[PDB]
Design brief:
This is part of a larger assembly, with nine protein chains of eight kinds.
Chain A (H helix, E strand, L loop, with lengths): L1 H23 L4 H14 L2 H25 L5 H39 L2 H7 L4 H38 L5 H6 L1 H4 L2 H27 L7 H30 L5
Chain E lengths: L3 E7 L1 E2 L2 E2 L4 E5 L5 E4 L6 H9 L6 E6 L2 E2 L5 H7 L3 E4 L11 H12 L4 H14 L15 H12 L6 E5 L7 H18 L3 E4 L5 H4 L3 E5 L4 E6 H4 L5 H8 L29 H13 L4 H11 L2
Parallel strand pairs in E: 5-10, 5-11, 8-9, 9-10
Antiparallel strand pairs in E: 1-4, 1-6, 2-3, 6-7, 11-12
Helix pairs in contact in E: 3-4, 3-5, 4-5
Chain F lengths: L1 H26 L4 H28 L11 H24 L10 H32 L5
PDB class: membrane protein
Keywords: Membrane protein complex, ABC transporter, Virulence factor, Lipid transport, membrane protein
Entry title: Structure of Mce1-LucB complex from Mycobacterium smegmatis (Map1)
């Protein structure tokens, strides 16, 4: 337990130093732009290619169960609720932890094994300010944007599928979206996306900085990054879902 | 922007009454009972049309029905 | 060849967990005997209408 | 035989998609229409 | 150049120890080489000298200040005297050779763009890269990567230079070229070049001082003449590449003329002070070693 | 123990805050929330002041952060102890005094002590950082 | 790095895990805290709850 | 380019499938060792339970999410006795298959890709080829057999833990009667759905193992390329898992929903 | 040992070529070493000689069959008379030294467990690892990994042995130890050992034949007596390590008595055949080279 606790302490100290560098030292705009564009180019097509079939499946299941129930006109409410509070943040979790966090960990491990971190450190530069802060900010920004895009594309695809395939009424879909989804739902979705992006960036950067070299250290570090990201983001999602349903729209 | 009445009140593509040859009528209702746009127009309880716009003119609602 | 007996330990504990989980899922959750028809006898009935 | 293998894989994928779409549409089973 | 004192240095990667009681005194401006068998942890020593690693015990005094006790605020200035060449150069791949060279200048000094370009071009010409500044680290060979790393290290006028395994992936011709370049830069700048390697050609022609690590210990540190005329089984075995001696099959079971600086280069002041210290050491050398050193110095 | 003393002091302060807040809410329910917030601010201000002093008490002793003692851990322990003790004693008093707003014993021990400890920790950390930065300027360049 | 691999990671881990647990607990019951959201509680006597929750 | 890559991956999967009997008859001990390694993890992740612990935690989280959201929405509407009848269906239709697929992908597939990349970089695949051993049959087919053997217990544990988490959250944290939950759970759950879900998960695991073995077997660029291979394999695995579950659910319940409530 | 007759070999990783035309004839049973500057793709040549890589043109004949263009079924039988030591051994971390050593003869030979243990222990004691058979590859050093890879190579009685940079990660002393072991192995089992390295101590002391790769070509291949008395500027520069010569600062800018086998080992049959071959070749050499070689042979 002592070794995992020490690793957790190192991660927490690194994140605290990252926050201090963000709020005290000047910000790196060029590196932030580069990392934002890199994350977008690595995790934009996969997030849509995962969101579209998943939302189509959810819409199909909801429509058939409700049609057998009898209340097929209230499918829009469940569609909007699921797409806003769960589907968006969860697809963000999957396609961010799998792609962006792993890419960040691989890049920082490559810098570490090539002694570029040591090259920065011997020059008096703190690599945290120059590297970690733009990557964490880029991760948060891209997570926010991707969550918004995922929710929008999921809702539109669900509408088109339900109307043109399962022959439900379009007016019932669009007029019931706001029945169970409101400002608290979109606000908690935004909070989820921001926290997920920040945690994924922090975990990826911390694992990349502490790579073990060797011949499998980078791959092991990336796998551990992915596992830790999945576990932590699922736990945070559970906590934030409880918090959000406490401030429910219907209650 | 100015006339944005909500996602529920925007015309939607597809469905009966949206293809070429569909006829457009104006129905001057005493009241709409909170009816939204894109609702179903039924003849003999058969959905064969759509209501497009529910603009209120001189404080008497008029419905555009295709 | 091989037989480190730590791999064997992992294998036996995994097999024990597998058997426990599979039996619990089959009995207490899926109710496989009920679905198959174990411990039950067959009866019939005639109705004027199904009644749903 | 890379190109032939890729063609076979693409054909298999297209056939799988077509078969699952036909199963979704219920094309295989035959029913009678009553007016 | 500045003298570097090391006293009672020790290291440990967990329970296992890398080396202990490494006591030495690297002179000022003189090229020195630390050698020993593979797996003795010499790159660890090189990194601990500048401050990348924190030894468990000991004291590394540079310019009178214990570099291990100095706070991180002061370490931003002590590392200004340093210039580090890594095994692969550690060049940043995102920026080309010109930008890699200019990076420490743009980070520390306040010079204008024209002066930066002048200094960078001068230092790239120094290390044999006159018209090769527009390439990236990923499209140059290992030798060119080492040259670019050296050029980046030679722009802030360093008083200490740390070269880590300059022979890695280089055939002896290219290693000889790099050794000649290091001799030349020590002639021009007098920058206390320190080299870490287990090569023999380097450790018989280049150094003014040499030391050897064996079985988590420092067997001896001293001048070139003293080390090349020592009847110590480990040193005599290693410097000749023999097979019979304390150094075993693997880690589990355990004079030639010096490289002269090229004509057209300023005279080296390291040799004179090294010989001056060699005489005082010869005062306490064994009689056979004394005769050998007297014969060598009087040529 | 420094953390024990700070926790006892802040627990007493939080009990006084709870008593005053209960009296004010009972007197004038309309402005009740405002009163609570005001008292909370006062509490925070108090912590902040001490934190600032503590920062000076560190920054004079050591010229560099590495030689400085980790005050964050001490303030976290003090805040946690203050929250736990204040919740326990407030729940004990609430059995004989109906003006306070106290929930079940487990809630006051854990859930609201978490709020008290987090607020105290954040305010103390901000105060210590500000106190150290106050004479960071005065340090020689 | 030297800073990340320092010999103070245990205390950092304890402090960080306590802080994260505290943050989660506060977020869970940010509205239910009595020291911040307190209103007087009145009572009534009824014959039956009638499904009231 | 694109056609060449499709042909290469098709050849790889064909050659990996056709060598399954060879590895079954010749490399039984390696298959058992890989079964143990996949079941109980490897490296620093093996001390916590390996794949089993990660799968269990993620499935518990998913079940808790289902229970919390469903109970909240139904209590707001009012018809909250249907919660179990809801949760079960979700766990069979969308949530548990996809979630178990993603967690299995992450853990097992990333481990396999890292191991195969390390073997490729360290010239162990070349060492096997020199010694007259079919490297693909020895490695990829053995991984496929181990995954096929291990997937059924893993998905059984995933389903059990998802059901347990949903029931515990609904009937302990929300204080719903256990009898009502059990009635609405066992009344509207069909074993046919669970069997088809198991078939989906088996096919999905085979596809995931093939994809990750493809990405890790042809790794390049030293230790750095292993991480990029892991990332690309993860992206492809997520896409494939979601697509497979969607297609299977569309095929099975396209015409007959297999659910009756009204007349 | 058996003879390898490379002819017209040419490798090209896309547009950039590694070597243009390599023509060799490696003698049977004699240690041979390939030399060159860094980045000349010597390890690529070592891999291509066994069939792991595919040269675009040329031919490589072992015995009398061209292994470059032959059915893949016959390749796994041609590679039976091979033993390869990679730069780090290429051991498997899942199994210890004993199982790694026993793998080649567990896969091919239908031998019993006791005979397997006997031969494995024999070959482990041959390479200086008597009681290190229970250790995993991750708990040993690089030199020990090279020894274990060699021991795994020696179990099936190879006719050809390939060595990929034995000097990697080893100082001159342990490299000298490994060179002595290789000479002892060739003295005992009489296998055609071929080494790829840029080291000079190995080049001047170990081999019976030497070859040179420079500027993507083959300079010359021949016995050590021919090469160590060569007037070619490139060969002389590389062998003596001279800074002045055709070899530049980087890739873009481009007689020793020999060590004897350990006393007690069988007389090395390679030495006599090498001396006979150089005696035959001697009448086509410069007079200074002829005089030097005659002085060396006497």
């Amino acid at each position: 337990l002592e070794k995992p606790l020490a690793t957790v302490g190192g991660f927490f100290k690194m994140s605290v130093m990252t926050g201090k560098a963000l709020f005290t030292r000047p910000f790196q705009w060029k590196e932030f732009v580069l990392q934002s564009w890199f994350l977008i180019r690595v995790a934009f097509l996969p997030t849509l290619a995962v969101s579209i079939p998943l939302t189509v499946l959810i819409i199909f299941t909801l429509n058939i169960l409700l049609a057998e129930f009898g209340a097929a006109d209230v499918s829009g409410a469940g569609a909007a609720l699921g797409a806003v509070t769960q589907l968006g943040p969860l697809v963000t979790v999957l396609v961010v932890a799998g792609a962006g966090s792993t890419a960040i960990c691989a890049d920082l491990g490559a810098r570490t094994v090539r002694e570029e971190i040591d090259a920065l450190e011997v020059l008096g530069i703190d690599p945290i300010e120059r590297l970690v802060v733009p990557r964490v900010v880029a991760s948060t920004f891209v997570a926010f944007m991707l969550n918004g895009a995922v929710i929008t594309i999921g809702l539109v695809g669900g509408f088109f599928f339900g109307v043109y395939i399962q022959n439900v009424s379009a007016g019932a879909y669009v007029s019931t979206l706001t029945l169970l989804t409101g400002f608290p739902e979109v606000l908690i979705s935004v909070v989820k996306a921001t926290l997920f992006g920040m945690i994924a960036g922090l975990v990826g950067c911390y694992r990349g900085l502490t790579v073990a070299g060797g011949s499998k250290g980078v791959g092991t570090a990336v796998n551990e990054t992915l596992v830790l990201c999945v576990v932590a983001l699922f736990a945070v999602n559970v906590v934030l879902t409880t918090i959000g349903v406490r401030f429910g729209t219907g209650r | 922007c100015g006339q944005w009445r909500g996602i529920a009140n925007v015309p939607l593509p597809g469905g009966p009454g949206t293809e070429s040859g569909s006829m457009t009528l104006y129905v001057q209702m005493p009241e709409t009972l909170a009816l939204n746009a894109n609702s179903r127009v039924r003849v003999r309880d058969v959905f064969v049309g759509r209501v497009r716009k529910i603009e209120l003119i001189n404080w008497v609602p008029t419905l555009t029905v295709d | 060849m091989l037989l480190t007996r730590f791999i064997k330990m992992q294998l036996v504990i995994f097999l024990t967990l597998t058997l426990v989980a599979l039996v619990v899922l089959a009995l207490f959750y899926l109710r496989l005997p009920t679905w198959a028809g174990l411990g039950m006898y067959k009866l019939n009935a005639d109705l004027p209408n199904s009644g749903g | 035989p890379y190109k032939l293998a890729g063609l076979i894989l693409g054909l298999v994928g297209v056939l799988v998609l077509a078969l699952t779409w036909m199963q979704f549409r219920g094309q295989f089973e035959d029913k009678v229409q009553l007016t | 150049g500045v003298q570097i004192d090391v006293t009672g240095l020790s290291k440990s990667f967990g329970s296992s120890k890398i080396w202990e009681d490494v006591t030495m005194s690297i002179p000022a401006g003189e090229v020195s080489v630390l050698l020993g068998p593979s797996g003795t942890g010499k790159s660890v020593f090189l990194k601990s000298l500048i401050g990348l690693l924190r030894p468990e015990r000991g004291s590394i005094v540079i310019d009178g200040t214990d570099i291990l006790q100095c706070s991180a605020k002061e370490l931003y200035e002590i590392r200004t005297l340093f210039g580090v060449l890594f095994q692969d150069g550690a060049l940043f791949g995102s920026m080309n050779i010109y930008d890699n060279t200019a990076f420490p200048l743009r980070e520390h000094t306040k010079k204008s763009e024209s002066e930066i370009r002048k200094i960078v071009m001068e230092k790239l010409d120094l290390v044999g890269m006159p018209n090769d500044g527009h390439k990236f680290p990923g499209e140059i060979s290992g030798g060119m990567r080492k040259r670019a790393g050296l050029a980046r290290a030679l722009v802030l006028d360093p008083e200490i230079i740390l070269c880590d395994e300059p022979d890695s992936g280089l055939d002896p011709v290219r290693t000889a070229y790099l050794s000649q370049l290091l001799i030349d830069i020590n002639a021009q700048i007098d920058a206390t070049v320190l080299i870490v390697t287990h090569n023999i050609n380097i450790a018989r022609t280049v150094p003014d001082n040499m030391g050897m690590l064996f079985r988590k210990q420092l067997v001896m540190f001293g001048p070139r003449e003293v080390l090349l005329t020592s009847e110590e089984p480990v040193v005599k075995q290693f410097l000749n590449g023999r097979r019979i001696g304390p150094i075993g099959m693997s880690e589990e079971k355990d004079v030639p003329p010096q490289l002269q600086a090229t004509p057209g280069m300023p005279e080296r002041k390291a040799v004179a002070r090294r010989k001056a210290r060699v005489r005082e050491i010869l005062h306490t050398l064994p009689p056979a070693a004394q005769a050998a050193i007297l014969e060598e110095l009087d040529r | 123990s420094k953390w024990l003393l700070r926790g006892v002091v802040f627990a007493t302060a939080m009990v006084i805050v709870r008593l005053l807040q209960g009296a004010l809410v009972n007197a004038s329910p309309g402005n009740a929330i405002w009163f609570s917030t005001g008292l909370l601010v006062l509490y925070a201000i108090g912590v902040a002041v001490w934190g600032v002093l503590d920062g000076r008490g560190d920054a004079r002793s050591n010229p560099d952060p590495d030689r400085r003692a980790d005050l964050a851990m001490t303030w976290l322990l003090a805040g946690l102890a203050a929250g736990i003790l204040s919740g326990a004693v407030s729940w004990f008093i609430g059995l004989f005094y109906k003006s306070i707003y106290t929930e079940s014993l487990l809630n006051e021990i854990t859930t609201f002590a978490a709020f008290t400890a987090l607020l105290t920790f954040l305010v103390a950390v901000a105060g210590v950082t500000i106190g150290r930065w106050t004479i960071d300027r005065k340090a020689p360049p | 790095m030297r800073t990340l691999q320092g010999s103070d990671r245990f205390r950092k881990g304890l402090m960080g895990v306590i802080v994260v647990a505290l943050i989660i607990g506060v977020g869970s019951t940010l509205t239910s805290v009595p020291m911040l959201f307190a209103v007087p509680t009145y009572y009534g006597q009824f014959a039956d709850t009638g499904g009231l929750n | 380019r694109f056609l060449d890559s499709m042909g290469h991956v098709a050849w790889f999967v064909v050659q990996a499938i056709v060598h399954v009997p060879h590895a079954f008859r010749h490399y039984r001990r390696e298959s058992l060792r890989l079964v143990a390694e996949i079941g109980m993890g490897t490296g620093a992740m093996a001390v916590i339970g390996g794949t089993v612990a990660i799968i269990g935690f993620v499935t518990l989280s998913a079940g808790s999410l289902i229970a919390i959201q469903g109970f909240a929405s139904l209590g707001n509407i009012g018809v909250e006795a249907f919660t179990g009848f809801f949760a079960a269906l979700a766990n069979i239709r969308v949530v548990a298959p996809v979630v178990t697929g993603q967690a299995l992908a992450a853990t097992v597939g990333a481990g396999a890709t890292a191991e195969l990349g390390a073997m490729r970089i360290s010239e162990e695949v070349d060492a096997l080829e020199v010694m007259g051993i079919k490297s693909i049959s020895y490695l990829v087919s053995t991984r496929i057999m181990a995954g096929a053997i291990v997937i059924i217990p893993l998905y059984a544990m995933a389903i059990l833990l998802s059901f347990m988490s949903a029931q515990l959250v609904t009937t302990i944290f929300y204080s719903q009667s256990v009898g009502t939950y059990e009635h609405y759970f066992h009344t509207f759950l069909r074993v046919d759905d669970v069997m088809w879900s198991f078939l989906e998960v088996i096919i999905m695991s085979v596809i995931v193992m093939l994809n990750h073995c493809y990405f890790g077997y042809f790794a390049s660029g030293g230790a750095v390329g292993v991480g990029e291979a892991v990332g690309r394999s993860m992206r492809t695995s997520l896409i494939a898992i979601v697509l497979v579950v969607l297609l299977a659910s569309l095929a099975l319940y396209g015409t007959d929903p297999n659910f009756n409530l009204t007349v």
